Design a binder for this molecule. Sequence first.
Ligand SMILES: [Mg+2]
Ligand SMILES: [Mg+2]
Lengths: 414, 414
Amino acid sequence: SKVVVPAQGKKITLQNGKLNVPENPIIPYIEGDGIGVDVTPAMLKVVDAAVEKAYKGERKISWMEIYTGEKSTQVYGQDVWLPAETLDLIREYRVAIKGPLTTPVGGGIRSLNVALRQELDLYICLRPVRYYQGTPSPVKHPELTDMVIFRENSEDIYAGIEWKADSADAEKVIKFLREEMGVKKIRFPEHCGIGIKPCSEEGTKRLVRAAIEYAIANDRDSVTLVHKGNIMKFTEGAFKDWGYQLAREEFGGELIDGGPWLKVKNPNTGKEIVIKDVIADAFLQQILLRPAEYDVIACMNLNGDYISDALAAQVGGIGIAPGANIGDECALFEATHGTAPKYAGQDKVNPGSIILSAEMMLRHMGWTEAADLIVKGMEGAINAKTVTYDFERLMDGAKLLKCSEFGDAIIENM
Amino acid sequence: SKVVVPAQGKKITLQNGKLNVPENPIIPYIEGDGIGVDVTPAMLKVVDAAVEKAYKGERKISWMEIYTGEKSTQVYGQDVWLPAETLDLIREYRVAIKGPLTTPVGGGIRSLNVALRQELDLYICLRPVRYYQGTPSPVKHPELTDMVIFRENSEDIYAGIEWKADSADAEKVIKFLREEMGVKKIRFPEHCGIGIKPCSEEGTKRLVRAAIEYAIANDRDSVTLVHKGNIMKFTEGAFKDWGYQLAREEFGGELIDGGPWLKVKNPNTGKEIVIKDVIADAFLQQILLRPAEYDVIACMNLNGDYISDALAAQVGGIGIAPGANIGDECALFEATHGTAPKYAGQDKVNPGSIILSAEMMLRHMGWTEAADLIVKGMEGAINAKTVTYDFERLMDGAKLLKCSEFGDAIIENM
Ligand SMILES: [Mg+2]
Ligand SMILES: [Mg+2]
């Protein structure tokens, strides 16, 4: 009702699990608050250059702007941070990409990013992190990191079931716990905030299955379930058990003997995928100390949030880190950094994150060539040391380009 | 009743907040399971060498072995993993040190380490991590890390209030939530584990106060409250607000202007301590990318568990990392690594963790000189490249010593 759906262009279609993508598909994009205003123009430009190059004119993307966050209040009015038609439109057109999003404080409004993920039941947050040769890194051997994070997006403490200290609600559920559940374990039951952490069997088996399938499909070497289950037995310890169980029941997992690790034969390559677990505090060490030991990572919502950020810092890509939130009916590719308001409009930040998320998008649509061209362009530009301010600070010999210009540098190395 | 309390030796005493340590104090030690059997002998030897050297014969520690974990079942019988007199004895004698501890699975027995912390209300888990010059590190500039973690030990998800998926209990509290609290937010309420995360005002103000006091007392530059409060408003977002509030109300915190950061003047040095917060996923990046920006860290129980391990890996000290659990009435210094059963009895693991925890112990007792001698000995031995297998693997030029021998190498460099 304020979106102008393109005259030329045809919806992607979901024909029983598989995506039927037209040659002129309408992809919705949410511009993004803050630096979205800079990074997004850079991505439409390089995706367009990459599908024109790959398919020689045959295919073209019809971009359709939809609204969430701060720009939505300037379009639908002050109170609408998340319009109900953005949810219908993403659902409808099947794949979408977005830039960074401002959630307001003071309004009782929960994270708009998390909101899109729960509202549209996009239960897979998939964050790939690998090293691009030549980016500055804090660590000695970032080239050893090449991991894929499958982070659960629909349950854990992120469900947002919590009550204020001294509220009536909080007073009521603490009474139920102490009186009716007989809990003698809250150190200070007075002035006490309360949060609920749910972890169900369906929620974790659907994420673990996506994780192992991804491993089979790209014949990755292993799947590590990380958790803190020695302390949280019935939510995080349930997650490692339900994941070993699904590997044994649905993928023919077998002990590498003695336990606990499982072998899964990839039906396609003949290779074995090891299915293992590491406790989450030790994991944060093991990714710094032995990165080559790890590959596909399956984990619950809070832990995957931390593991992503941490893995991203080490390979030197906190501003060129892509991501996706995938469910059964649709997907939303996103820049994974924030809105950086101090730089907005200055054309200077790194468009690399939202760009590499459009190669994930292009890849997901089956436009694999367009997509391989974007990562070709990326390695080209970085290796050219034809880089944006964030990378240049840390490099000797680089040429500083603006945001729009690193767009063009990616197109030149295609 | 199986402990043999020393003939010579006198209890430490708590005379209103301050510790009155005799010259021949009885310190209880829990040997430790697994490699405790190796690392502990090494620490009694070097602490003894360091108090003999410093005080020239005047002072001597009377060691008193007490039991927890696997060795306790071999002393009190199969069922007693944690004897009730270990809690009375630590309480009584005021300071104690322990080695790594085996908690059994299959028995419904929760973490024995966490058990000591909650049972004796040791609400401060204090983990200092700084770089010792010459230890092998995964990162380029570990010398930039010098941080002190104040991790809350008595509440958060670690309280252990949780119920099994499909249990009656779990079925009952999910019914209360959906029916009586009106929660329409559990994606899958069937087959669902449930955990409780409590965060009270007293629990966080006592930990934040210890954190800022430590900053004043050693005039450290800042205190960073880390949290994930944008998603968890009433437990983790309550923690950053209660911590800013205590800085303003009890330490005369003032805005560095515009907010949110506070200045606290150190009453002793005249210097200002900045009181700031960073969201926990960004923090895990900022400790890799800008370590010099951070110093004293205050945070809740799960986050501090992860932050410690992560910071410890980077400076290359996952086996030489000390710690303490401190409450108002007593303290327990501990090796912070595990029991490593494959190496037990081989005299080969690094005794550096439990040793550096005894310098924290010695320091806490006011035997500051003994203590400065242990860290002198540590920098000496490591710099000598007279090192244990874990360090030698990663170094070119080192001499490999056994565990007992790196004990002696620390004594030689005193
Ligand atoms: Mg995050
Ligand atoms: Mg830990």
